[PDB]
Design a protein around this nucleic acid. Structure first.
Ligand code: CA
Ligand code: CA
Ligand code: CA
Lengths: 226, 226, 225
DNA sequence: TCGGTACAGTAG
DNA sequence: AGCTACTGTACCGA
């Protein structure tokens, strides 16, 4: 992939692009993304029937293709996370010793069906996921518990990010500015071939299914960028 | 049942009313309504104890009788529905050819315990449920799955509207102004005698039970209109 | 006991009204009646701490290490603040007892365990007075009485009696929307099973917190000092 | 059934 | 993408 290939499908320049602005939203339209991918790999307790959270993501992506828009949502917990991310990144740079370059949005392949937006690409070749828990409660949970208390939606997000970029290891940092001390904590998460295999199987199935459903109602993927 | 009788029982002239103003809310106080009737017909997995959702609509309605107020809910989804309802009606009328008269409230009988407030009545004998769902996700869900997609709580609301109005069929329609094209979808629901019989069993008993509880506390149905 | 409170926090408990600023600060990382239902929850299965216990475990840990607490459930609390004085007056009128308001009461010198009564009555009973956000929940309690008071709230009342060492507590609901009969209350007697649960389980919660804090180089007390 | 917890599901 | 903050269903053992 190039910045250039992204101009031919969407007519947006990917370098003039801030993570959170109009252009960034448009580029994700109907694309399977790392923070949402947990809904794709979600399985029922029994049977072969899509759980509801996976059907809702299905139907949310289809609506993004056919409406060309994405609803704007707002909440303190969300505005908090957006407010502190920079400092999280700066503190994580200081402590870990690695340099972070910011990445806008990375697509896995030429179909632009799948993407992630890393919180950064480190100088040692790991990517970076930053969380600034709105609740000190959840930062505390991560601080004491480490790798093992990372929710599965977050594990799905990090692994899928490795699947997309082809990388082998990922930083997972939490930052809480209200902590008097010990307000940054992080781990390194190695690429998990069991997740990788699971995305090679499920993600192409989700895609073919979205393509089935759009045809039925007379839309095509890419229509959101036309 | 007619419009003079509502004045006698409630003080409210139904003719001055349009969904969903002040008096629109008054006329519903304490009234088992189609949007909420799913709570009434909810049944436990085993046994005969009223499930929580049933007990909770019970106390809600009771609280309406005794306070004379409904707490204002769902401002966001209602402001959206009110901004689009005229285009949705218009667009349903161009598309179906059918004329739609609005209806503020229809009670089932003189007791005035039971009622629906349809989005309209159609020149061909059907009623209308016309939703502008807040999320295009929901539009999409119904646009593809059709009939079987329909919120379980919606089927109940529809049937019950036929129970209340005696009518034999009902349009169920979704409108989404955001869809680039084909943003009205609609099906026709047939009156189901299995629901009708459910209502004939469970609704009278729900009413009697509200009546005992009001007598326990020295209240009487209809006090909300005094 | 008013003196000992200064030596830890510098705060005069006399300057203190329910909801204010100095108030919020005396509760940080303290195990409160309102939340104690999380401490005595039992697993659905196995014998590890259930999630809600862990979650409350992590919440107070964060109070200790941040020195702050978010304002949670704002609208219900604003509703309670709005009708507080009227609930009380109605309650005094109807029970015949006089209410003396009380800020925080700690169980002991440790200052690990505490409650905030809605009042202390002239008959020696404490008072929990809620103005339920929905009239629906008022209705539930009016119609159901003692046995429809939910689990979180029974534990709230009983813990209050554990902390204050009292034998009975009024549990009241007020609803100003109710056209008439908008007060309902009942008396809840000390339950020795709850006391025993608190005696076994609460100091153990406290010892895990301490251990937990040590791991990250913090100490209880640090939220104030 | 009952007295709860855990977690899917969804709103904001 | 943000990261909760709810409610109502499923599940678990007594
Ligand atoms: Ca992030
Ligand atoms: Ca409607
Ligand atoms: Ca209280």
């Amino acid at each position: 992939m190039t910045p250039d290939i992204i101009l031919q499908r969407t007519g947006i320049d990917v370098r003039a692009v801030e993570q959170g602005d109009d252009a960034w939203h448009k580029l994700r339209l109907g694309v399977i993304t790392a923070s949402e991918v947990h809904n794709v790999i979600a399985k029922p307790r029994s049977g072969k029937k899509w759980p509801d959270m996976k059907m809702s993501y299905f139907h949310t992506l289809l609506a993004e293709v056919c409406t060309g828009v994405a609803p704007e949502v707002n909440a303190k917990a969300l505005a908090w996370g957006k407010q502190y991310e920079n400092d999280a990144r700066t503190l994580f740079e200081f402590t870990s010793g690695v340099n972070v370059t910011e990445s806008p949005i990375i697509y896995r392949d030429e179909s632009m069906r799948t993407a992630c937006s890393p919180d950064g690409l480190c100088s040692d070749g790991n990517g970076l996921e930053l969380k600034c828990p709105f609740t000190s409660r959840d930062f505390m949970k991560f601080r004491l518990g480490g790798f093992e208390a990372i929710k599965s939606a977050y594990m799905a997000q990090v692994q899928y990010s490795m699947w997309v970029t082809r990388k082998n290891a990922w930083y997972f940092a939490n930052y809480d500015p209200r902590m008097k001390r010990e307000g940054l904590h992080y781990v390194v998460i190695e690429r998990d071939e069991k997740y990788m295999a699971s995305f090679d199987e499920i993600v192409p199935e989700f895609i073919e299914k979205m393509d089935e459903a759009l045809a039925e109602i007379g839309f095509v993927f890419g229509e959101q960028w036309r």
